[PDB]
Subunit: 447 residues, 4 copies
Amino acid sequence: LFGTAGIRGTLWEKVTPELAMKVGMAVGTYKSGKALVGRDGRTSSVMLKNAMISGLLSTGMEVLDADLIPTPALAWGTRKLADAGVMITASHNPPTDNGVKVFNGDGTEFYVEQERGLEEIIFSGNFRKARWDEIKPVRNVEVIPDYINAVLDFVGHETNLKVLYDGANGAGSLVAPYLLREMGAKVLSVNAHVDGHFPGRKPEPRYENIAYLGKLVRELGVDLAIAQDGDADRIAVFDEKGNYVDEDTVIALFAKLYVEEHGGGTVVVSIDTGSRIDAVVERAGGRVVRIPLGQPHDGIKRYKAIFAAEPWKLVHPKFGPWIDPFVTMGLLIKLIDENGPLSELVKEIPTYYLKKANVLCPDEYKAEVVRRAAEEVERKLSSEIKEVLTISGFRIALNDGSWILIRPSGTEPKIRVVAEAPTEKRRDELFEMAYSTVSRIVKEAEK
Amino acid sequence: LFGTAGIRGTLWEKVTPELAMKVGMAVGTYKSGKALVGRDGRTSSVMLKNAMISGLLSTGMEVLDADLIPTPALAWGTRKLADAGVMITASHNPPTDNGVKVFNGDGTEFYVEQERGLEEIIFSGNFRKARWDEIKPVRNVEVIPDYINAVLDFVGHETNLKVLYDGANGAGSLVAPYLLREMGAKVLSVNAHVDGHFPGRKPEPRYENIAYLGKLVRELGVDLAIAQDGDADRIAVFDEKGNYVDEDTVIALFAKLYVEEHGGGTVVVSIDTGSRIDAVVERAGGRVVRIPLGQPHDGIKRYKAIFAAEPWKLVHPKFGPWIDPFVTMGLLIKLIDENGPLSELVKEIPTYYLKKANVLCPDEYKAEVVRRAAEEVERKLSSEIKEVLTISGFRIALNDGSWILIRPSGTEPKIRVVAEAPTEKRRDELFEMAYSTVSRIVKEA
Amino acid sequence: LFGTAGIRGTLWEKVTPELAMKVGMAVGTYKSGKALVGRDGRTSSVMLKNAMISGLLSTGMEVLDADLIPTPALAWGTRKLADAGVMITASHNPPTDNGVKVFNGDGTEFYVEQERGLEEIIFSGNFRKARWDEIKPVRNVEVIPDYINAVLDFVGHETNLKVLYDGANGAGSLVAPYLLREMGAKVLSVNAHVDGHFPGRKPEPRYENIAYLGKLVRELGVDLAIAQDGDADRIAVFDEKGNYVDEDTVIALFAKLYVEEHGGGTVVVSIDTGSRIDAVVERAGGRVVRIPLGQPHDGIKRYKAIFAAEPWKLVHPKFGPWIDPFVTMGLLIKLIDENGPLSELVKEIPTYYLKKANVLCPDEYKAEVVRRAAEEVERKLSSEIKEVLTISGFRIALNDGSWILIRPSGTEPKIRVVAEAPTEKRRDELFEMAYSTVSRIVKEA
Amino acid sequence: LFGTAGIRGTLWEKVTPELAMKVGMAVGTYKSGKALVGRDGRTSSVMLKNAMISGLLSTGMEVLDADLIPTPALAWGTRKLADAGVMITASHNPPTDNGVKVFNGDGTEFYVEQERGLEEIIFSGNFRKARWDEIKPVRNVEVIPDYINAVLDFVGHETNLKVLYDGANGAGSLVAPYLLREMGAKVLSVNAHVDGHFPGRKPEPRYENIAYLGKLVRELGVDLAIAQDGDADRIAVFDEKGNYVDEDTVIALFAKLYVEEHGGGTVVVSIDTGSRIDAVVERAGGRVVRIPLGQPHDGIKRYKAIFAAEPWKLVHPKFGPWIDPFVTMGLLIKLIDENGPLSELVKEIPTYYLKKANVLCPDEYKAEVVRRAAEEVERKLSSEIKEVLTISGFRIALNDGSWILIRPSGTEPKIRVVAEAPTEKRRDELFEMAYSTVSRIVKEAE
């Protein structure tokens, strides 16, 4: 059931009312006391929330119903109010899809160990049943105003910046515009009316889904563009010139800020974030530990990290251990007002050049093909190896700051192939090697 | 799954979230358009309503959420607003129980065809599945105030009577006090805070549960007492003396007034309602048909009748097809204001005397036992037999207005034994005979 | 505008939407930050709450709207949530009336200088005005469940008692029956549906408005009857024998309880409470001080008291400064469960005999009549005299524990007369002296 | 208290909680039965709505609380649900201001006679007071989804057009995006999160507040842009090329559509809508009658009109006697899908050239300066006069389709001066004559 980022899938195939009721029933067998429930704007979300609540109620848990809320606010509100938290969302997936994310009473997403717990209870049907006289009444709660205040107290900044905010027709529309305006920003919102058909654009704030914003920034005269996904756990940014600031740069900006403050410390990033981060962290005298994509919070506990991130998701541990783009965009505005325009701050981040691509493989082979292709690429680059990470596929780092990721995704039946180098010519050289080496090996096992 | 009146049963045994959702899914596979959804105050109802609503939504039906409402208001609202109605309730059962009642867009409970249809669909697992872009938002609706206005306009009576209302800690507490006050009634309410532990009393307004009201009537100086079940589709009444006005006298009163205004016409009642009703209806020039316990309005269509009833449950078809105790309490008060105290109006209703007991019998041998027992009673009394009905067990009617009913039960494993006579002796004789005939057959096989 | 415990009067006469708006304006000129807003169930209370809320918002205060909650829950919620509280209510006044009560961030009612401060601002019309961009959104808050949990945690007692709860169709109906149920009590409720017409009875839980409850306690076999007013700040109790436990007996029971645990300590009662409190407190080695009818907490601050009370209104300082009958309720159940049936417990209380009546008197002839009709009775009986109190009219205490009270009413044009003595004779002779001493000096002018 | 379109003003100066409570007390003295109450997103709207409901309750009226709703949804819901309608809004004014609009049970705005009735009642203090036992409980109602269903039913059109919707941070944002999506439109919204600070732009959809939209239309490849005000009773449009379609062109598309349908009929437009209406109405065999600003509904009963409009505000009598930009945007999409791109459709509208400015005049003179100036411009144009309307200021129509408006606004120390002509030279020449004539006569009385 759980992938890397919760339970996610297409309606009727994987995600059903029946399952959502099973997950509530399992959350109230594994955990007890109070459950904070929230949902995103998808057409199926109220249907799945009513199932979830039916499930949670059946176990004797007191349900606190927050209804339509961004995921971060559900994580924050869970810490403040509840013993467990449940979010109805498929985040960045199309409107055919929904899912469930589960949170603990400290605001952290479920650990791998806790997910397997919940699945064992679902597979067994061994659910805690309340007596009739232990079934607690639902309590409606209003979290967004408290969340917005907690984010303004944390950020401690006033602005006059003009800001373009793109809400993907999602839960961020009920929080980001108001937060920015409270800070004294002049907000021009796009896709900031909540709509589960995602009429504005595909909700995932990939560059190709939000490219129009770069043009909007120049015409409008804004200091900064901010885009989100449907449950607003992601953040994407454009500068005052309408340049897309890519995800590694956004992370590098904060990785530098955090390490320089502390005069050092551990930063934790995903296996698939690049050398912009190692570059600015080492120069300022801290270190980088890489972990699998999915659990940026996990790294904080293990490595005592001051900052953790994956592409589009930063964690601000002094605020709390959830991905918090509301903190992120608040602090990005403080960075600009305190140091000058965003395009000049991105110049102080070194250029690397990434090139990724999927290369299709059956799920039966997947793992064999990666293991055999990592060995071959290592051998061909043996003169240049700095380190091989094995924690999530194979990340091969080279002496000059280049690296290759060869990794199977947990879901789709294919292999992820990333290469990054300090030059375009070498981005191309290494990507070709990695791509074609995987391509050729795939078609071997396929005959 | 469906008995006489909805799906009922105990939490976790037969009634679950899983089933509540499958029923929603079934209703939205069998019908389309709008579902009006309501619940009573049991501790499990919001949980089941959540599951139900998930069900309904998954089929592309547009849910209207009326939340905590009495069943008659759900029936009325279903006719105003929706193509189907669903009610989370077990009406008069203990706090441990809940269930679902399903209504059509004209306000009638499911007919047997439609119950079976729904049962097949659940068994099949073949539920209609909306596409993501056909799942409809929930609409919250406030029914009670419009329901109250509709009763008030139908009854068209102001009053100054003092009324004692017992809402059985249930859904009636949100409606009857306010309808009585709007009519002019001075209401003293008991058990009129909503609570699914039913702390005040067992919710079923059987005399044995509501008999304290008798003495309360005396002290408080009230004209009338009204008592209800947890979803408020039952009504029981006490008079100004504090005397219980049993369920046939109540039906008799309504039978009498309906057959008079008309100048005759048909009155459908249950197979277990006795001769108080036959007496007033023939005297005022009308006829009585009988059906099985379940939906009095089945009768109305079938026997073009002007009134129908079972014990506690009266239908006023000029208003609508559903059991409507809110109409009943409004017309009882109108009756009294126009004609004089209730105790006076009940003297003008012939006495008969009823004794009833249940004899346990396995759900398996029920048809078998009755069969023999009834033909034995037919033989032992053959000189007197005026009529035998086989529609629900056997109702053996004698020449001297007496009768014996020997009926198999539905949701319990017992046979139901009843006698009505015009004397305490002729009663005691026909019952302590009829009971021991069934009793002795059950002690063989 | 303010009397002893709030602004109150007749709709359209003294209390208007206009006044309700000016008070909101005045509160948010005198204070800043957050205002918690609550109301009782009177017909006019939503109209005045809207006017009140418009007032507060206009000053830049952040309004927290609790809607329909009892006064104690508003005072409790104010301490938890806000810088000021506002209650729309006239507590025990008839349905023709409403009012406002203003609370501080610690949950105390308006102190006199706040009252005067507020009145000058209203007369002046110089109200703080928010700029457009400082008017704050209303926040809806659910207080009752949290207030219920706070009271349970403080009473620390589960029971199995049967209890008769009479909510005067008022705000207590949404709270008492559920607090009693979560403890384990089997609640039988009367007048426990909210109704601003107060159909059940006069909302003031005077013996003669709630008399009927006595013969009802016997009938149902309850261990205790509890009655409140419409805002539920008041409590009145009958025992399992259906004997009215008069209001000093209740006070004395808690007096005894609070002083015995402590080993002495001081007890603030109002000037018109009797010798029952004097006796159980001295006996237990504690000290009794009298203050005027108003706010019993003024006593806790001044005299570091462990317990304050007036007739029908107890304060439990360990919980909070407000009159809290939800705490009284629960500690009284815990008393009975720990020391036996209530009728027994009221026997361990000394008996005195009380009589009172009102003499109509113009406002300008109150200051005059009393002082000069008290000079007189002070001289006649200056043999016995143990102490005269003049802090609130004249209260003449004798050496045999007897006493007389002549007092000018706050909010009505009449002189109040009270006599109490250890004996049936000594009582009836004092009341008849003092009552006709006034009546006579009235017809001088 | 009432100006053109309801009671409007700056917070604390004219518009107060105490005023809003008086207006409620007045409406429940002038009218009986049920009152539907709505508001816009202004920071003061909840404060004034609470005061309004307090007033209305005090008179025994049954209050139906629709909360935050656009004005057109309030007029339609009033017709469905109630005997009176109240809207808390200052519509297009800055966030410093608020206001009250009142509506009859048939969904018409209050007539001048009805406004005086209310003002007298407010000025006398003689409000109907309910007895305690007649104060009715407030009923919360959900109008928007019923309203969207009625507009979709009335429009009878499915689409796949791309559409830029600009909600000006206002009540339109809760209806227009959903009504467009349900028609099949691919909606990209700007300023479609409600906020009383109007952070996106000034909510009045004059061209100069919404100029940026024309630029976004091109970049984004949209077929149509639609911009509204704060209460969404106004509509403004840009075509697929980012061309601002001016308010007379929008009215004219619809005058022509309505007059071609009926082969004739009367169209009622305000005194300051110009000649492109006359061109398409006469060419299809209909006639144009003019009335003053603010009363476009008054045309329907008075002149039996099939369509009525003033700049930004169109009435579709067959749906209701209120300004309904939701019906408008729906019918524009239907127009475009059935006839071709918007830019092509506006080419079939004859070109006139307008030029407007104000001239400062003390309130004490105003009337005198306009009367004298109009007599003087008439005489100078005497060889050319088609018609001179006096119903609101002086509108001087010439034989060639040109015209001059000289009008004192009934709320400000200035005189409004319009001139339109088939040609640029004639525009300039006629505007030069009228502007300078008025400008001179002002300073003599000084």
